[PDB]
Design a protein around this ligand. Sequence first.
Ligand SMILES: [Cl-]
Ligand SMILES: [Cl-]
Lengths: 295, 295
Amino acid sequence: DLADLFPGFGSEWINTSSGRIFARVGGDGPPLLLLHGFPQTHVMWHRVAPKLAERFKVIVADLPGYGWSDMPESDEQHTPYTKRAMAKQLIEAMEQLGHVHFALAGHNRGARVSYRLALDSPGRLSKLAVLDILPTYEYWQRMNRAYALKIYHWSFLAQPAPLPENLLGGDPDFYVKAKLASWTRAGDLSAFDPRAVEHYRIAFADPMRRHVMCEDYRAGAYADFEHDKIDVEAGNKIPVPMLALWGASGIAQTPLDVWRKWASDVQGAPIESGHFLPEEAPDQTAEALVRFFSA
Amino acid sequence: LADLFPGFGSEWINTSSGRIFARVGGDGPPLLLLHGFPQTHVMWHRVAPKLAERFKVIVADLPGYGWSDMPESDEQHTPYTKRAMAKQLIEAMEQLGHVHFALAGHNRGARVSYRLALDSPGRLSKLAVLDILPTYEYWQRMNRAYALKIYHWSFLAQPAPLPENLLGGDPDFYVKAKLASWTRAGDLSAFDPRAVEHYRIAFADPMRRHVMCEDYRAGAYADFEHDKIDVEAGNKIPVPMLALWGASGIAQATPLDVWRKWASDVQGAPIESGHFLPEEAPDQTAEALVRFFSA
Ligand SMILES: [Cl-]
Ligand SMILES: [Cl-]
């Protein structure tokens, strides 16, 4: 059995037109939605969510298709796993709780859902934080030999099915543990609570969950990139006050200079960390978020 | 299993780095044929007979491929660099008394071949390369579109053991998917099933797959650097050269225009074919090669 890493938090299974969203819910105050990414689940926030819950009503949700959220059937354009669709789905979920204007922090895929949400539906957000990402358009635009080799999984997981699925199926534990370790500052699993690692491992052990992850990266290579391209070529900037927090040894890395192209009111800082800020640097991440969302 | 070369002998040729296996047939001027990935010498079985009508034809397994020995690699992937492979095949040809010969290569073998022509042009009377551009040129072109289309250049080049671990789960699937995906038909129908079995059998060995990954690691690092030095120096191949490519192959972004920057005497032509010219279009490939190599 898997551990409860949010002692005292409630658990909700929220219906939407696209399927259920699982969330842990805690605290009180202004509403704050937290969105994980790949290859994780909502439990990645367990080291910062208790502290945030001292100041906010904290909703820690599994992305569409991840963790214990339902997995909609995909299609030829990977539609349910595009960040545009994921953002619509999470907007519906928040409405089910009575939240139509909320604060939002995301990491990895969830940060992409978050800035896409801000571009499509800025009225929904009071403030936005994105953790260790650049826009999907910027990742692809900088593509060259060095980046192709340094950060290969974007193009690998986006290959047509069932190629990535069949490769991942032989020994899935090895792949998910290798990715978790590889993107940390030290390159091992020491930053992670082993109970959290087991949550990630159990999700990754389901071929249906792995297929969703590949669909997510297929969206990332195609429709998500196209959606982004339209905004940057039109000069659309996010007007929601924004924080870009990144790891000095992360994937996104200046990110603030990139984000200033995409957002008219953005602040930012690095933290000494690899990619997984809320687990590698929980006190600093929690502090940065509390201070940003409270101001 | 299955002998696909009527009237060819079988030879193990000694070198300082290990044995090279080759099928040997015909008489007349010497012509070396070099396969690539994920194949073996048997890929030439539909064109070698026609060539052996006019030439002494040596159909070799690349160093570390097929039945050739596998020299131990190192941190710089040295023995599977094209410079090293070319030196090893030059030694093998010297064992047969061939110090000036014609050479045709496909895929990795065509990279060995143009590297051989750049390093040791005195060894070659004429050179044909099938459906490739220089490694430098593919990497220079590695934008989003190319990262997606030739993802395996970055995936197979990831540090060991990441691709080795993934390929071990279902190697038959991967090799058959690669074979099919690069043909015009998109299935295995262009191949002799007996040939496919040769490729599957080789790919079934973890040691052979490791060699392939070392080959792509070389392709991402030393091979690229070697090419970059020639580009910077403005070096061109002086050997009479033929570039053949598939109308729906990988090299095509205009192949003859590219090769003219790398070679001072080159002619070329498209063939209605996917990547695997000698199997998808054996009659037209053989005819083109015969006419070119004939004096
Ligand atoms: Cl990024
Ligand atoms: Cl190649």
